Amino acid sequence: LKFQCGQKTL
Amino acid sequence: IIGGEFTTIENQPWFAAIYRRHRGGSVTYVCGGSLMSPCWVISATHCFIDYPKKEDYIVYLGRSRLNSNTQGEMKFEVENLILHKDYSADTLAHHNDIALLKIRSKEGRCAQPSRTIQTICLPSMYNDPQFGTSCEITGFGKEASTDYLYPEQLKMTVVKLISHRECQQPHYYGSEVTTKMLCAADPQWKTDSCQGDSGGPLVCSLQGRMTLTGIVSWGRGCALKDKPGVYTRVSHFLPWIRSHTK
Ligand SMILES: NC(=[NH2+])c1cc2cc(-c3cccc(-c4ccccc4)c3O)[nH]c2cc1Cl
Numbered sequence: 001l002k003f004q005c006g007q008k009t010l
Numbered sequence: 011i012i013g014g015e016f017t018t019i020e021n022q023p024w025f026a027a028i029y030r031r032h033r034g035g036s037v038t039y040v041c042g043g044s045l046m047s048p049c050w051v052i053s054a055t056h057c058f059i060d061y062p063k064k065e066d067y068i069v070y071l072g073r074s075r076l077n078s079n080t081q082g083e084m085k086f087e088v089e090n091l092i093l094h095k096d097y098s099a100d101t102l103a104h105h106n107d108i109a110l111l112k113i114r115s116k117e118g119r120c121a122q123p124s125r126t127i128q129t130i131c132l133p134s135m136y137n138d139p140q141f142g143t144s145c146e147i148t149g150f151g152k153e154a155s156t157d158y159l160y161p162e163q164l165k166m167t168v169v170k171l172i173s174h175r176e177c178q179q180p181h182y183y184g185s186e187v188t189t190k191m192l193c194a195a196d197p198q199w200k201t202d203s204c205q206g207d208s209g210g211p212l213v214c215s216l217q218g219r220m221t222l223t224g225i226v227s228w229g230r231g232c233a234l235k236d237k238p239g240v241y242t243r244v245s246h247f248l249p250w251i252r253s254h255t256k
Contacts (some may be wrong), residue, residue, distance in 0.1 A: 003048065003123045005131035006213075006220035010020050 011149055012233040014167030018074040021166060022148045023128035025210065026051045027076070028111070029068045030061065033145035037068065039076055039160055042149040042210025043111065044222050047131045049089075049120035050255050053209035054225050054242065055097040055109040064091040066178035070111050076150045076162045082126045086113035092254050094247075103186045107227040108242045109209075110254055130211060133245040138192065138216070138223060140234030141173040145194060145223055147239070151206025155232045160206045161219075167201040169194040171214065171223075172238055182236050190246045192224045195238035203239045203254040204232030212241045 019025060026043035028051075051069055058067075065088075070143035072083040098105045113120060121127050139145070148166040177183055177193035189195060194212060196202060203210070203226045212224030224241025231237055242248035244251075 001123065005024075005036075005129040007128055008023060009125050009128075010019060010123045 011147065011151060011165040011169045011208055012153060012166070012204055014165040016163040016165045017023065017148065019072055019126045019164060021078060022164070023126050024130035024227070025148055025164070027070045027073045027150065028053060028057065029067060030207065031066050039150055040067065040241050041208045042226065043069070044211040045071060045121055045127065046132060047129055047255060049112050050227065051111045051113055052168060052251070053109050054104070054227055055093040056099060056104045056107050057209045058091060058093055058109055059097065062091060062093060064088040069111060071121050072124060074164050076160055078162065080126070082124055084115060084121060084127060086115050088112070089114040094250065100186070102183070102228060102230065103240065104228050105188065105190070108225055108247050108250070110251070111199045115136065130213060130222045132248065132251065133216055133221045133223060135248050136245050138243065138245050139171055139214040141171050143171045143214050144168045145171060145212050147203045147210065147226060149203065149207030149226065151208065151212040152204040152232065155204060169196055169201065169239065177238055182238065183240065187240055190243050191227070192241045192243045193238035194224065194241060196233070199233055199235045202229070202233035228245060
């Protein structure tokens with residue numbers, strides 16, 4: 001969606 | 011990376027791969043970097059110092075392999091290449107080894123967020139994790155100090171931050187390591203960063219966030235006993251970063 005620093009998505 | 015495991019960019023979505031074009035047709039890998047914001051990637055000055063011609067570098071985000079494509083990747087040009095004023099290297103250390111690259115796609119856009127492209131967080135002014143903390147390093151650098159090629163698959167490993175007292179021991183690096191550097195090593199000197207991992211990230215969790223704590227900068231050998239990897243201490247360069255990323 002938009003950047004969220006430090007977040008990985010798996 | 012010596013040791014470590016092979017991974018995919020989803021596990022390090024803020025990792026940027028920088029390559030250089032050669033008149034002749036080849037493209038070679040140069041260093042790793044990290045996405046700080048949509049249009050800025052941070053790396054190390056020593057990766058560019060010998061050839062500071064921005065038009066010849068290419069930056070890719072969302073890449074899990076070195077010379078083959080990854081679906082979802084984005085290719086960028088370097089709009090601005092900012093090296094640090096006070097960068098110096100001696101017989102080992104590189105001082106003020108940080109650089110910024112402003113990227114632009116051929117369509118005029120910066121990075122766009124996806125499951126393979128994310129930004130990494132910056133620490134607060136001079137705020138670091140305590141020594142002992144385990145951080146991860148990722149990159150396409152050498153797997154053995156004797157190799158002359160880079161792996162095709164991205165690797166990652168975990169190392170621990172060590173104190174300056176330990177690193178400045180005469181039999182480690184002595185006074186070559188300053189307060190603007192951080193040392194990290196594997197308790198058993200088994201895994202480490204190496205040539206090619208240069209410019210990439212040292213990520214630790216700080217105050218709940220995965221934060222870019224260091225930039226792969228220098229070291230004696232790779233995975234050598236009492237020879238930690240030395241990283242640029244990002245928390246001490248925040249004014250400088252701000253100065254260009256406003
Ligand atoms: N953890 C370590 N022991 C370590 C080893 C190396 C080795 C290098 C390195 C070696 C040769 C050339 C370059 C180089 C020179 C110009 C451009 C790009 C890389 C390196 O960064 N960088 C390093 C950074 C680290 Cl922490």
